[PDB]
Design a protein around this ligand. Structure first.
Ligand SMILES: Cc1ncc(COP(=O)(O)O)c(CN)c1O
Ligand SMILES: Cc1ncc(COP(=O)(O)O)c(CN)c1O
Ligand SMILES: [K+]
Ligand SMILES: [K+]
Ligand SMILES: [K+]
Lengths: 422, 422
């Protein structure tokens, strides 16, 4: 059986983001923040399954919501019909966002949310009789895996397989991530984005994460998004914030953008929204953007949509996730336990192979000098009983939001033990 | 007042897919082939929820499979780990496909499957040291809603929001769909695709559906895919068959391409694979294509992947779907009952307003002379208690594969009554 399982994987399964050339762990069961492999070895899962297990494994509220809705109605095509969970989820998600962010479109993944967002930005300007094709982004940003999503990024492995479908101006970090959390760095960042925005005709949108995930758990200086909000007002560009990773408590606020206290024009969301239990993603925008689509000549609406976008089970699970977050105070717990986590790890920056320790809420990153060190850190933490996420030179701790104080201490100890062996 | 509140929150907060900005039934529960709205009215659901409920609503085997896996492990990141459902599903899907199709990549939607398939096609040629950028498609084809997927289509509402990321040669239908089922139509289609393939440097791939869904339930003549197989074999282009709609029994074979009896180089799948119960999609290709990715200079593998691609609950549900399809013989049932459905509808072509009646298995279409007639037909059928899908001029019946002879007769009677009132 173990022979056969390894063999069917080797022969038939194509893994994402992996080389064709140690065996991978086979995970089989989880409970709370712990997960177990096929040999019975147990681990604290400090990568939250796929950076999205906001409520941990086998959460009874999420399980029951899924079961109830699956039995009733898994979905129905929302193009010419509706269902009750889509209405509830659309209302509830709008309710968590600033005034004016009221209109929610559902898709399956963060990449599809990016696809819809970029279409909405371009088409909005067409609808207004003033076409704009250009977007401004971070070079170190990651917005998904489809051609349009990858085109927004300047990360080397995101090189696209065609030619550019529209112009993008990708802003490089003006300092190393370790030095980005100062007032001096805010000035450099704001001015770099001002130059990018004013380089040629006004852009359709500026699209950024509030904390860069795949780009290395990069924490931005206070005021950066506020500076972008001002730039967008001056130029007309839509401010799009990608909350796919930061959304729903990850950083110790309901959304990453709330640390700066800005109101975006469009927000994308996925990951923690459904606890990872059903594929689900969403975007929310303004009534002005929405209503502009009455000018679309071909349909009189947005020419976008997926078969399972707005899946009823996904919507029902998301509502249960939001109930758990609110009932248990997971946003506040993430802030408080997050502070403990970061404080526990911070002294490891004294180690010669550790360049920086940085984070916000329940994302924390140990940046090593080389990827080789990062891989060795991750391997030793695994030996200590803790699963972490490697991202090039960065090692990231991204636990379920239901993590407790004892488990945070265990996480810190494992990372200390790993750094000692570097 | 509950229903009023529901309609109001939808109107205020929900952005529907593929819809005009400027009312809709609210479906609340289903069982087998029947669904009920919020007012209590019941219908035979002859659009299978979202053209994807292969096993109908509240199927106990699928419900149990979802419950069991959700409780164990909803997913884990497949980039550097594995889980047992992904290995099982990869093997099982490959086993249903012809010899040589062995390597399966998982994504959430048909649109993502197209994104991955086009990247694979382009990157495969780069890996070989002979870059090829061009694809050949049907202008009336539909492959999804993201920019790349829309670019493959020539349908007017799929106009993209940027410029072409690669060249596409889109073949127009040489005859109306009603005249496309003959040996003369085969000659015209084969010759048109030959001209497209030989127009300029050899293409990377030829990508087609085996029966055009969104293009109007268009049935292609016997031998068309065999002609494309020879053209791909002549020029080296990859033969990509889009089975997102036709896959898993819909046309009375396990795959739509099996009517012609060809071996594609890559097949995309979604819809019926998970019964609609969890968002799920897949693609399967050859070892020749797979192993070429060792030459990728940035990763040594395919630079693609989604957070929830290979979702364990989705995989476990797909395994249960395949068990139901096989145990119940739904492929052959769809062939036989589908032939009875088409034979029941066929005399309606005598009506002045009906220009064709066409189908294969459990997709059947009544083509009207104008969209207004099609809309009227759908509306009267709904009054008779049957839900059908409008696709421009085309009215489509796409029931769950578990439909029985009595329900087929109900379906035929509703459509007869509808056509009588045109
Ligand atoms: C900020 C951000 N945006 C978009 C995505 C893409 O989401 P998916 O993998 O669900 O397509 C990710 C995935 N890591 C992300 O971190
Ligand atoms: C043949 C075909 N390919 C791809 C897609 C796109 O799939 P999705 O809606 O799941 O993105 C569809 C959707 N109708 C389809 O019919
Ligand atoms: K709001
Ligand atoms: K095979
Ligand atoms: K006629």
């Amino acid at each position: 059986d173990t022979d056969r399982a390894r063999e069917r994987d080797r022969r038939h399964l194509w893994h994402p983001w992996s080389s064709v050339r140690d065996d991978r762990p086979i995970l089989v069961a989880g409970e709370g923040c712990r997960v177990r492999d096929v040999t019975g070895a147990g681990y604290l899962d400090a990568m939250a399954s796929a950076m999205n297990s906001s409520c941990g494994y086998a959460h009874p509220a999420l399980l029951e919501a899924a079961r109830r809705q699956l039995e009733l109605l898994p979905h129905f095509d929302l193009s010419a019909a509706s269902h009750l969970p889509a209405g509830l989820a659309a209302e509830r998600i709008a309710g968590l966002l600033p005034a004016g962010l009221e209109r929610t479109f559902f898709v399956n993944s963060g990449s599809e949310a990016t696809e819809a967002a970029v279409r909405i930005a371009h088409d909005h300007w067409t609808n207004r009789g003033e076409p704009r094709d250009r977007l401004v982004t971070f070079a170190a940003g990651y917005h998904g895996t489809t051609l349009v999503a990858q085109h927004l990024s300047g990360l080397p492995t995101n090189a696209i397989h065609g030619t550019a479908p529209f112009p993008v101006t990708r802003v490089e970090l003006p300092l190393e991530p370790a030095a980005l959390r100062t007032p001096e760095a805010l000035t450099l960042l704001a001015d770099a984005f001002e130059r990018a925005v004013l380089d040629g005709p006004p852009p359709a949108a500026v699209m950024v994460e509030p904390l860069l995930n795949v780009g290395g758990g990069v924490v931005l200086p206070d005021g950066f998004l506020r500076a972008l909000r001002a730039l967008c007002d001056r130029t007309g560009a839509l401010l799009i914030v990608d909350e796919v990773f930061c959304g729903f408590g990850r950083t110790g606020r309901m959304f990453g953008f709330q640390h700066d206290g800005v109101t975006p024009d469009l927000v994308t969301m996925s990951k923690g929204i459904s606890g990872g239990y059903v594929p689900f993603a969403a975007l929310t925008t303004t009534d002005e953007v929405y209503r502009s689509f009455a000018a679309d000549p071909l349909l009189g609406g947005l020419r976008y949509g997926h078969t399972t976008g707005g899946h009823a089970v996904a919507c029902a699970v998301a509502l249960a996730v939001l109930d758990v977050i609110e009932e248990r105070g997971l946003v506040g717990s993430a802030a408080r336990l997050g502070a403990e986590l970061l404080a526990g790890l911070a002294p490891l920056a004294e180690h010669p192979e550790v360049t920086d320790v940085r984070g916000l809420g329940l994302v924390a990153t140990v940046e090593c000098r080389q990827p080789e060190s990062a891989a060795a850190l991750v391997a030793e933490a695994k030996r200590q009983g803790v699963l972490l996420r490697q991202q090039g030179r960065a090692v990231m701790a991204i636990p379920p939001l239901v993590i407790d104080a004892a488990e945070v201490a265990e996480l810190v100890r494992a990372v200390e033990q790993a750094v000692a062996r570097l």
